Design an enzyme around this catalytic site. Structure first.
Site, PDB file in Angstrom:
ATOM      1  N   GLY A  95       0.818  -1.198   0.000  1.00 49.52           N
ATOM      2  CA  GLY A  95       0.000   0.000   0.000  1.00 49.52           C
ATOM      3  C   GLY A  95       0.854   1.252   0.000  1.00 49.52           C
ATOM      4  O   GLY A  95       1.803   1.357  -0.779  1.00 49.52           O
ATOM      5  N   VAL A 100       2.552   4.628   2.618  1.00 53.57           N
ATOM      6  CA  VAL A 100       2.770   5.260   3.915  1.00 53.57           C
ATOM      7  C   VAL A 100       2.906   6.758   3.688  1.00 53.57           C
ATOM      8  O   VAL A 100       3.620   7.192   2.777  1.00 53.57           O
ATOM      9  CB  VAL A 100       4.001   4.706   4.649  1.00 53.57           C
ATOM     10  CG1 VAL A 100       4.247   5.503   5.930  1.00 53.57           C
ATOM     11  CG2 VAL A 100       3.794   3.234   4.996  1.00 53.57           C
ATOM     12  N   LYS A 103      -0.299   4.378   7.360  1.00 50.09           N
ATOM     13  CA  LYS A 103      -0.145   3.325   6.371  1.00 50.09           C
ATOM     14  C   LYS A 103      -1.525   3.004   5.810  1.00 50.09           C
ATOM     15  O   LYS A 103      -2.449   2.696   6.564  1.00 50.09           O
ATOM     16  CB  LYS A 103       0.493   2.072   6.970  1.00 50.09           C
ATOM     17  CG  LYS A 103       0.625   0.936   5.950  1.00 50.09           C
ATOM     18  CD  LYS A 103       1.448  -0.228   6.491  1.00 50.09           C
ATOM     19  CE  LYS A 103       1.427  -1.403   5.530  1.00 50.09           C
ATOM     20  NZ  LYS A 103       2.023  -2.638   6.119  1.00 50.09           N
ATOM     21  N   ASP A 148       8.062 -11.659  10.421  1.00 48.68           N
ATOM     22  CA  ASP A 148       8.566 -10.991   9.225  1.00 48.68           C
ATOM     23  C   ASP A 148       9.615  -9.963   9.625  1.00 48.68           C
ATOM     24  O   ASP A 148       9.657  -8.857   9.077  1.00 48.68           O
ATOM     25  CB  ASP A 148       7.442 -10.329   8.426  1.00 48.68           C
ATOM     26  CG  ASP A 148       7.862  -9.994   7.001  1.00 48.68           C
ATOM     27  OD1 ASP A 148       8.892 -10.521   6.534  1.00 48.68           O
ATOM     28  OD2 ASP A 148       7.166  -9.193   6.353  1.00 48.68           O
TER      29      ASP A 148
HETATM   30  C1  LIG Z   1       6.938  -0.064   5.006  1.00 48.26           C
HETATM   31  N1  LIG Z   1       7.774   0.105   3.801  1.00 48.26           N
HETATM   32  C2  LIG Z   1       8.546   1.291   3.458  1.00 48.26           C
HETATM   33  O1  LIG Z   1       9.154   1.178   2.351  1.00 48.26           O
HETATM   34  C3  LIG Z   1       8.688   2.570   4.230  1.00 48.26           C
HETATM   35  C4  LIG Z   1       8.924   2.403   5.748  1.00 48.26           C
HETATM   36  C5  LIG Z   1       7.476   2.900   6.055  1.00 48.26           C
HETATM   37  N2  LIG Z   1       7.433   4.008   7.040  1.00 48.26           N
HETATM   38  C6  LIG Z   1       6.695   3.920   8.229  1.00 48.26           C
HETATM   39  C7  LIG Z   1       5.814   2.749   8.653  1.00 48.26           C
HETATM   40  C8  LIG Z   1       4.514   2.997   9.108  1.00 48.26           C
HETATM   41  C9  LIG Z   1       3.697   1.917   9.459  1.00 48.26           C
HETATM   42  O2  LIG Z   1       2.379   2.228   9.956  1.00 48.26           O
HETATM   43  C10 LIG Z   1       1.961   3.587   9.841  1.00 48.26           C
HETATM   44  C11 LIG Z   1       4.120   0.611   9.341  1.00 48.26           C
HETATM   45  O3  LIG Z   1       3.231  -0.487   9.716  1.00 48.26           O
HETATM   46  C12 LIG Z   1       3.109  -0.596  11.114  1.00 48.26           C
HETATM   47  C13 LIG Z   1       5.378   0.343   8.892  1.00 48.26           C
HETATM   48  O4  LIG Z   1       5.821  -1.050   8.768  1.00 48.26           O
HETATM   49  C14 LIG Z   1       7.207  -1.263   8.542  1.00 48.26           C
HETATM   50  C15 LIG Z   1       6.254   1.377   8.527  1.00 48.26           C
HETATM   51  N3  LIG Z   1       6.851   5.123   8.916  1.00 48.26           N
HETATM   52  C16 LIG Z   1       7.747   5.920   8.094  1.00 48.26           C
HETATM   53  C17 LIG Z   1       8.264   7.245   8.308  1.00 48.26           C
HETATM   54  C18 LIG Z   1       9.155   7.760   7.265  1.00 48.26           C
HETATM   55  C19 LIG Z   1       9.488   7.011   6.126  1.00 48.26           C
HETATM   56  C20 LIG Z   1      10.406   7.456   4.928  1.00 48.26           C
HETATM   57  O5  LIG Z   1      10.589   6.600   4.027  1.00 48.26           O
HETATM   58  N4  LIG Z   1      11.084   8.691   4.583  1.00 48.26           N
HETATM   59  C21 LIG Z   1      11.183   9.957   5.305  1.00 48.26           C
HETATM   60  C22 LIG Z   1      12.700  10.436   5.273  1.00 48.26           C
HETATM   61  C23 LIG Z   1      13.722   9.252   5.512  1.00 48.26           C
HETATM   62  N5  LIG Z   1      14.271   8.644   4.227  1.00 48.26           N
HETATM   63  C24 LIG Z   1      15.580   9.274   3.899  1.00 48.26           C
HETATM   64  C25 LIG Z   1      14.482   7.143   4.402  1.00 48.26           C
HETATM   65  C26 LIG Z   1       8.950   5.722   5.933  1.00 48.26           C
HETATM   66  C27 LIG Z   1       8.065   5.207   6.977  1.00 48.26           C
HETATM   67  C28 LIG Z   1       7.349   3.308   4.559  1.00 48.26           C
END
Ligand SMILES: CNC(=O)[C@H]1C[C@H](n2c(-c3cc(OC)c(OC)c(OC)c3)nc3ccc(C(=O)NCCCN(C)C)cc32)C1
Length: 307
Positions: free
Chosen positions: A28, A30, A43, A144
């Site tokens: 999906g 985020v 998410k 996972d």
């Molecule tokens: C899951 N796959 C992905 O590729 C990414 C990781 C996921 N992400 C979450 C997150 C959220 C969840 O719930 C809401 C969740 O499920 C509980 C989950 O599960 C693993 C992750 N908070 C995040 C906050 C920021 C970022 C981000 O990229 N950049 C910002 C700048 C940093 N930059 C240089 C790398 C990605 C976030 C998107």
């Protein structure tokens, strides 16, 4: 539960404005959202992963998971945005993003390396340990665990994310959720007993030992990026050299089950005390025999003694 008072939870989604899309995959999307001018992570689950949304929602609401090394749950909702019904999971926003992405952007010193791995072991131990009593928690196996499911905090600690595949066990209750095949996670990180489907699906401790295998692989990923004498390895996913991208079960079985290969240890790690200790630690996570693998608490203890 783990999040807002619940009545608050239902009103949270309507108070959130989505500002930027920071991640997109088959899971999906985020987004960085704002709730009362404070950042939150939202998410939005694909239809493919809708059951993961439901299971994680069930869990965080039935168990009050609150730990500095577990992603902080705020609310879950089936809401409407732009006239489409959507499945939202709302959590604390960690600007740094995933450990996977972070490791490709910078390198680590001894302090920041140890802070990362210790925080993951502390989070995993808290998941794994069953706490009895009215304010306790069932044991939880993640199923996972990998660098994309770990988030980095500004202070250099991490927290474990994505409980949509997790299984719970109360020593009182019987039966483990499990269901379907045991090969539910990411193939690259799967333990031998999962790949060859000999895991005893009925034994909850089997699932903890599967998490430990994956933790060992995460330790290897992180240690590669710790600088020693101005030396460091580029980021590589586990088994990058011996298996293709999106590897198949058969690819993984031959490497890990038949050959019993493990990620290679860079020679330079044995010029540094910390990396030497981490190499030994990860090898104790990768035993073919799952019952020989260290527990999360033993890993935590060993990491606390390293300096
Ligand atoms: C899951 N796959 C992905 O590729 C990414 C990781 C996921 N992400 C979450 C997150 C959220 C969840 O719930 C809401 C969740 O499920 C509980 C989950 O599960 C693993 C992750 N908070 C995040 C906050 C920021 C970022 C981000 O990229 N950049 C910002 C700048 C940093 N930059 C240089 C790398 C990605 C976030 C998107």
């Amino acid at each position: 539960g783990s999040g807002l008072p619940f009545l608050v939870q239902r009103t949270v989604a309507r108070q959130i404005t989505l500002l930027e899309c920071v991640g997109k995959g088959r899971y999906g999307e985020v987004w960085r959202g704002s709730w009362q001018g404070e950042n939150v992570a939202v998410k939005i689950f694909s239809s493919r992963d809708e059951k993961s949304w439901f299971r994680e929602t069930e869990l965080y609401n039935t168990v009050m998971l609150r730990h500095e090394n577990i992603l902080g749950f705020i609310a879950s909702d089936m809401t409407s945005r732009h006239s489409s019904t959507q499945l939202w999971l709302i959590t604390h926003y960690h600007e740094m993003g995933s450990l996977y992405d972070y490791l490709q952007l910078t390198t680590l010193d001894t302090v920041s390396c140890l802070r990362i791995v210790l925080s993951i072991a502390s989070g995993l131990a808290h998941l794994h340990i069953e706490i009895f009593g009215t304010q306790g928690k069932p044991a939880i196996a993640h199923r996972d665990l990998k660098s994309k499911n770990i988030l980095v905090k500004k202070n250099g600690q991490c927290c474990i994310a994505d409980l949509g595949l997790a299984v719970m066990h109360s020593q009182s209750t019987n039966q483990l959720d499990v269901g379907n095949n045991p090969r539910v996670g990411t193939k690259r990180y799967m333990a031998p007993e999962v790949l060859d489907e000999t895991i005893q699906v009925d034994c909850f401790d089997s699932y903890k030992r599967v998490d430990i295998w994956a933790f060992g692989l995460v330790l290897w990923e992180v240690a590669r990026r710790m600088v020693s004498n101005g030396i460091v390895e580029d980021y590589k996913p586990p088994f990058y050299d011996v298996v293709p991208n999106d590897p198949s079960f058969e690819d993984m079985r031959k490497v890990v089950c038949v050959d019993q290969q493990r990620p290679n240890i860079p020679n330079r790690w044995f010029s540094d005390p910390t990396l030497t200790s981490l190499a030994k630690l990860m090898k104790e996570c990768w035993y073919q025999n799952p019952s020989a693998r260290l527990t999360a608490l033993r890993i935590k203890k060993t990491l606390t003694k390293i300096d």
